[PDB]
Amino acid sequence: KDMIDEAYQLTKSVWLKGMRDELKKVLTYEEAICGSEVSEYISSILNEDVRLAVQQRIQAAREGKRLPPMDFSIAFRMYYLGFIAHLMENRITNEVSIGTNVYSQDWSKTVRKLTKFGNKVIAGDFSTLNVCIMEKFADLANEFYDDGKENNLIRHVLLMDVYNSGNPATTPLNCFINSMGLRMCFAICAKNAGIKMTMKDFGKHVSMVSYGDDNVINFSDEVCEWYNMETIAKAFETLGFTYTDELVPKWRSIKDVQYLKRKFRYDEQRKVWEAPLCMDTILEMPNWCRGGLDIQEGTKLNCENAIMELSMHEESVFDTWSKIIDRAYANATGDHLDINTYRGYAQERFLEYYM
Ligand SMILES: [Cl-]
Ligand SMILES: [Cl-]
Ligand SMILES: [Cl-]
Ligand SMILES: [Cl-]
Ligand SMILES: [Mg+2]
Ligand SMILES: [Mg+2]
């Protein structure tokens, strides 16, 4: 139907909150590669044979033609990174989790946003192409920049190669499909159960957040018997997407759900919301070889980070596994880790993010 149009308008209101004029510029080739001092979120990732290829790509886009990988990434960043930097500066309340600092108050902010309409909460990821939602991503970028007919054509041409290209290309795009596809699901879930609500009632019953293809969705009890994992998964295949649950209940609680390979843990003693990383991920950070074979430059640092990551689980888990990781590294290398205590890591996070 013409619901893509109302999805797009609702989303725009949300995603455009907090606009800064200093960010509505296409970046120079140098800014695209080494960042700019306008944002903490525009940062730095032959020297003149590829600039000549970016040039060929930009001009060919200006006349409507697209070409066929590093030059694509720099171009895309030039025309889109200010927008992405805007989403990151207004993160979480704008439904976009790109830029979340899980060691900081962002995590409790994410929790405050996913408990806004009660206790029911779901999570999962989508998989496929739907060029009608993708199209509108170019549109919303263009609406953000307001910089002329030519730039708009370039954003539309670049977006057509994003999936075949990189990380900053598909990740905010899939965030957009999330915010869009789940307002659409809300509307098609109300027609199949004959509820006299419209997409403008989404923002009164649903709070959501996304990181690329992965989301967490909070919804009120009022809407929960017709808008939940079961119905939303079905609605989402009407749009061309499989929508699996990470790990089928109709809802859960914020403490049961996994997001960015982490969980929402409230620490009763230290009264704080923390982001324990899955042990299966933590435990692939060290090199366990007892002969210290492929010890790379970052092996020591990888071990230290794994142990820092243990400090956001309960203390029992940090006490068990930090000793295991510490002894393994010692026997393998004959060297030692510089690690902190449990409350030492907690204090590190307080001094840097709560103060
Ligand atoms: Cl299509
Ligand atoms: Cl775990
Ligand atoms: Cl987990
Ligand atoms: Cl071994
Ligand atoms: Mg993912
Ligand atoms: Mg593993």
Examine the domain organization and report whether 65 and 161 are in the same domain: yes
Examine the domain organization and report whether 222 and 282 are in the same domain: no
**Residue 269: inside a domain, yes or no?**
no
Alpha-carbon distance of 165 to 163, in angstroms, equals 6
Contact 199, 7 (CB under 8 A): yes
Examine the domain organization and report whether 240 and 290 are in the same domain: no
Examine the domain organization and report whether 10 and 38 are in the same domain: yes
Give how far Cα 293 sits from Cα of 286, 287, 288, 299, 325, Å. 12, 9, 9, 11, 16
Ligand 5 centre and the CA of 220: distance in Å? 26
Contact 142, 17 (CB under 8 A): no
Q: Which residues contact 209 (CB under 8 A, 6 or more apart)?
A: 92, 95, 96, 97, 110, 113, 114, 215, 216, 259
Task: Please tell me the number of the ligand nearest to residue 265's CA.
Answer: 3
On the CB side of 104, CA atoms within 13 Å amount to: 7
Ligand 1 centre and the CA of 204: distance in Å? 30
**Residue 264: inside a domain, yes or no?**
no
Examine the domain organization and report whether 23 and 122 are in the same domain: yes
- Resolution of this model in Å is 2.7
Ligand 4 centre and the CA of 290: distance in Å? 4
Neighbours of ion ligand 5 (CB under 5 A): 212-214
Ligand 1 centre and the CA of 181: distance in Å? 14
Q: Which of 256, 287, 307 is the last residue of a domain?
A: 256
Task: Please tell me the number of the ligand nearest to residue 288's CA.
Answer: 4
Examine the domain organization and report whether 172 and 70 are in the same domain: yes
Give the chain's domain count.
2
Ligand 5 centre and the CA of 128: distance in Å? 13
Q: What is the DSSP letter of 164?
A: T
> Which tokens sit at 164?
């075949």
**Residue 298: inside a domain, yes or no?**
yes
**Residue 284: inside a domain, yes or no?**
yes
Domain that holds residue 345: 276-353
Q: Which of 256, 291, 314 is the last residue of a domain?
A: 256
Ligand 2 centre and the CA of 309: distance in Å? 11
Examine the domain organization and report whether 281 and 142 are in the same domain: no
Ligand 2 centre and the CA of 317: distance in Å? 10
**Residue 213: inside a domain, yes or no?**
yes
Q: Which of 256, 285, 301 is the last residue of a domain?
A: 256
Examine the domain organization and report whether 319 and 206 are in the same domain: no
Give how far Cα 186 sits from Cα of 83, 182, 193, 203, 208, Å. 27, 6, 11, 10, 12
Examine the domain organization and report whether 331 and 244 are in the same domain: no
**Residue 143: inside a domain, yes or no?**
yes
Alpha helices in 123-201 (DSSP H): 131-145, 149-159, 167-191
Ligand 1 centre and the CA of 101: distance in Å? 35
CA torsion, ordered 205, 140, 123, 285, to nearest 10 deg: -150
CATH of the domain at 134: 3.30.70.270
In what side-by-side order are the strands of the sheet with 214-219? 206-211, 214-219, 120-127, 242-244
Examine the domain organization and report whether 14 and 74 are in the same domain: yes
Examine the domain organization and report whether 124 and 221 are in the same domain: yes
**Residue 270: inside a domain, yes or no?**
no
**Residue 313: inside a domain, yes or no?**
yes
Contact 149, 247 (CB under 8 A): no
| 3 state SS of 172 | helix
Q: State the sign of the Cα–Cα–Cα–Cα dihedral 174, 178, 180, 184.
A: positive
**What separation, in Å, do the N-terminal and C-terminal C-alpha atoms of the chain show?**
49
Q: Map tokens 């699996």 to a residue.
A: 244
Examine the domain organization and report whether 223 and 284 are in the same domain: no
Q: Which amino acid is at 117?
A: F
Ligand 4 centre and the CA of 289: distance in Å? 4
Ligand 6 centre and the CA of 173: distance in Å? 29
